[PDB]
Each structure stands twice: as C-alpha cells, then as structure tokens.
C-alpha cells in the first residue's frame, strides 16, 4: 500500500544528509517524514558491518569480543560490536574481517553473514550486515593481538564471557559513565533468555 | 581523555537536527563529526523498544514483532514494538503503552535495560529495551485490540522464539522486508546460546 513519492534534500553535510520524505499512507493520504541518510553509500548492499566475534580457546569459556570508543554523537564512551563502513567494492565479509583486525587485532574466520538489517528505521535509512566470526584464540596469529587503528581511530578491546555477558555489561555500566549499544544489549538479553 | 568542545547547529527540522560536533581526540588534536539528534528529547532516553514474549500454554513461546512502512527506509521493516517516551512517562509505562497501541497485547514488565544507543557513530539516539511477558491465555489478550494513533499502520507478526532467526530469514527471502538490527541480534544470540 505505502510508498515514497519524493525525497527533497534539506541539508547535506560531508558524511550525513537530512531529507524531507513525502510518502503515500495506506488511507491514500500524502504525508511527510524527516529522514537521515549517509552520503557515503554507493553500491554497497549496506552502509556498514558489525562483527559478532566469538573468541574460542581451549579450556576457556567462549568470549564475545567488544570495543569501547568515544562517540562524538553521544558525547561519551560506548561499548559496541566491532564495526565499520564497507569500502566501495568491498564485500561485507571482507569488511567484517578487516574491521575486526583493525579494531581488535584478531584474525577471524567467517561463520555467517546476515542480510542488510536497519539501524534505526524511524530515523535513518542506515543498514548493516551483522557478520558472525569465530576467532581461534589458540592460533599464534591471535596470541598478542594489537589493534591497527586508522587515522582518528582510538579503540579499546573488552572481551567478555558469553555465558555471563549481560551481567558483565551491567557491571561495566555500574562502574563508569558509558553506554552499551542496543545490538550488544539485545544479544546479551537473548543469551540470558535462552 | 576525549570530550566534546562545542556543537554547531547545521540544520533543525521539526523532528531531527544535524550538528557539527567539535571534540578533542586522544592525541590532543581537535576534530569534527557530523552528528544527528532528535528535537523531541526532554527523559532517560528517546524511546523504548519492547521484547514481548507471548506465553500460551501448549504452544511455543512467541516473540511479538511489528511490520510497518518506514519512510527513511523506503520500505517495510520488521521491528520490536517501539515508540518515543512521552514527557513525564517512565520507560516501563511507555513500553506497556506502546505494546498495547501497536499489538493490542497487555503485558507484564519482566526487566528494563539502562539507556542503550541506537547508532552511536551517527546519532545520540537512545532507548530502553523492555522485556515484557504476555499471558496469552488471559481473557484480555484473547482478541488483542491494536490502538494506532494518527498515522500509525502496524501489522503484528508473532514468531516462535525457538526458531526466530530462521523464521526471520524466511520473511526476508519471501516478503522483501528489512529486519531490524536489534531483532536480528536477539535472534542470533538465541541460536548462539549454550
Ligand atoms: C522522525 N522524522 N520524522 C518523524 C516524524 N514523526 C511524526 C511525523 S514525521 N520522526
Ligand atoms: C558520520 N558523521 N560524521 C562522520 C565522520 N566520519 C569521519 C569523520 S567525521 N561519520
Ligand atoms: Cl523472558
Ligand atoms: Mg569502527
Ligand atoms: Mg574502523
Ligand atoms: Mg512505533
Ligand atoms: Mg506511538
């Protein structure tokens, strides 16, 4: 029933733009919406990837590898899955493995790749692939993992056991001012609920 | 170590604004970011998203989701029930209220996250994730009456919790919908548990 009629640019920054969206509602009436989009999306199947990195080591419990970094939009530190935008011509898998290595030092193995999923669909058109990757932490490559941060990238690695993820996240939030990402919290809540 | 120095308004709509954030990087170098904010926040968070666990004896437990046209996305998305928290509303009350308006179900609160970020590289948007159980055998949830406000047009989709990820992949392959990243993350973790 519903569809886009027009998209009018309101303001276009270097990285983000705002649009006035006109659409047809299902009563047959015309309505508008204020829409955010990135300026960086070309032919990628999504804007970005977020990596679910399951660190596996003999005689260790499985960990989920997370990162902490300052996020200017939030004005503070956030704890997230490793993530980045997909470079033009780059596959989501390759982007995932690359971002994981850049942010954490770890060299992973692909497990699964989601279809493009929406980040905040009432606000923006932004999408990611969620890429599950296993890290063989017994491999020598993954012994002394050092982030290769890019220019203006400053990332801390936090590995938490999968079997206690939600409480460990709660214990981090209780100890400093910091925000957990909604996807990370959602993933931790399901681990509890299962 | 990092912090915000200043925020310049670039453009302000009715619902969304775009800012240029200046911040201090951890080397002591001054940097800028293009940040989105909502104009509606006053609250612990912008919104709530509800994880509604539909419990009916002798049935599988279902997670109740919603399908709506999302003008920023140009298409239909499958999401947790959700909405913005009203001025002077608690996150718990917003959750039960939105769950009722969007699904017709009357639920009980199980737990409530701290404020969690939606897309912290882009926006300051936050939500509380509120887990709610729904006693599907109670008479008030027999014929769930959805109360859509002005301009809401929501379809309800209940899916079994124990197969959620495969059920969502099936809808994406057949119905050309976009699944929400929080929904998908929850689904993934139900599979990855144990
Ligand atoms: C975010 N962008 N536009 C919106 C709207 N809410 C009601 C009408 S337009 N939210
Ligand atoms: C989204 N908003 N601002 C951005 C930037 N990326 C690199 C420098 S500023 N992305
Ligand atoms: Cl539950
Ligand atoms: Mg990143
Ligand atoms: Mg990066
Ligand atoms: Mg809603
Ligand atoms: Mg509403």
Indicate the angle between helix axes A182-193 and A165-175, nearest 10 degrees.
140
Q: What single string gives the DSSP state of each residue in A80-93?
A: E--EEEPPTT--HH
Give me Rg for the CA atoms of chain B.
19
Find out whether the beta carbon of B15 lies less than 6 Å from any atom of ligand 1.
yes
CATH for A152: 3.90.79.10
- Report the half-sphere exposure of A47 (CA within 13 A, side-chain side): 23
Tokens of A66: 């997370």
Which residues of chain B make contact with A54, given a CB cutoff of 8 A?
Answer: 192
B111, B106, B103: which is closest to B158 by C-alpha?
Answer: B103
Other beta carbons within 10 Å of B61 = 16
- φ/ψ of A100, rounded to 5, equals -55, -50
Task: Name the closest-CA residue to atom 10, ligand 2.
Answer: A15
Range of the domain at B192: 1-194
Mapped onto helix, strand or coil, the DSSP state of residue B13 is coil
Q: How far apart are the first and last CA of chain B?
A: 38
Tokens of A36: 């955010």
Q: What is the resolution of this structure in A?
A: 1.5
CB neighbours of A28 closer than 8 A, spacing ≥ 6? none
B101, B177, B153: which is closest to A27 by C-alpha?
Answer: B153
- Report the half-sphere exposure of B27 (CA within 13 A, side-chain side): 7
- Output DSSP code: residue A163: G
The total number of structural domains that make up chain A? 1
- Output DSSP code: residue A144: S
Cβ–Cβ < 8 Å for A158, A79: yes
Is B115 annotated as contributing to ligand binding? no
Find out whether the beta carbon of A120 lies less than 6 Å from any atom of ligand 1.
no
Which residues of chain B make contact with A152, given a CB cutoff of 8 A?
Answer: 25, 31
Indicate the angle between helix axes B181-192 and B164-175, nearest 10 degrees.
140
Let me know the angle formed at the C-alpha of B183 by A155 and B120, rounded to the nearest 5 degrees: 30
Which residues of chain B make contact with A115, given a CB cutoff of 8 A?
Answer: 169, 172, 178-179
Q: Which residues pair with A130 in a beta bridge?
A: A50
Q: Which residues pair with B67 in a beta bridge?
A: B78, B155
Ligand nearest to the CA of A70: 4
Mapped onto helix, strand or coil, the DSSP state of residue B163 is helix
E strand or H helix at A117, and its extent? strand A117-118
Cβ–Cβ < 8 Å for A11, B18: yes
Separation in Å, CA of B184 to nearest CA in chain A: 7
Q: How far apart, in whole angstroms, are the C-alpha atoms of residue B107 and residue A193?
A: 17
């Amino acid at each position: 029933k519903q569809y886009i009629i027009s998209e009018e640019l309101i303001s276009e920054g270097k990285w983000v733009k705002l649009e006035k969206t006109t659409y047809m509602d299902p009563t047959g009436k015309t309505r508008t919406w204020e829409s955010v989009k990135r300026t960086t999306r070309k032919e990628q199947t999504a804007d970005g990837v977020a990596v679910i990195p399951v660190l596996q080591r003999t005689l260790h419990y499985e960990c989920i590898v997370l990162v902490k970094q300052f996020r200017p939009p939030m004005g503070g530190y956030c704890i997230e899955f490793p993530a980045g935008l997909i470079d033009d011509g780059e596959t989501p898998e390759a982007a995932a493995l690359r971002e994981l290595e850049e942010e954490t030092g770890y060299k992973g193995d692909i497990a699964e790749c989601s279809p493009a999923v929406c980040m905040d669909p009432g606000l923006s058109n932004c999408t990611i692939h969620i890429v599950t990757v296993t890290i063989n932490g017994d491999d020598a490559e993954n012994a002394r993992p050092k982030p290769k941060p890019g220019d203006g990238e400053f990332v801390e690695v936090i590995s938490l056991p999968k079997n206690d993820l939600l409480q460990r996240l709660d214990a981090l939030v209780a100890e400093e001012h910091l925000t957990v990402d909604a996807r990370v919290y959602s993933y931790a809540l399901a681990l509890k609920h299962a």
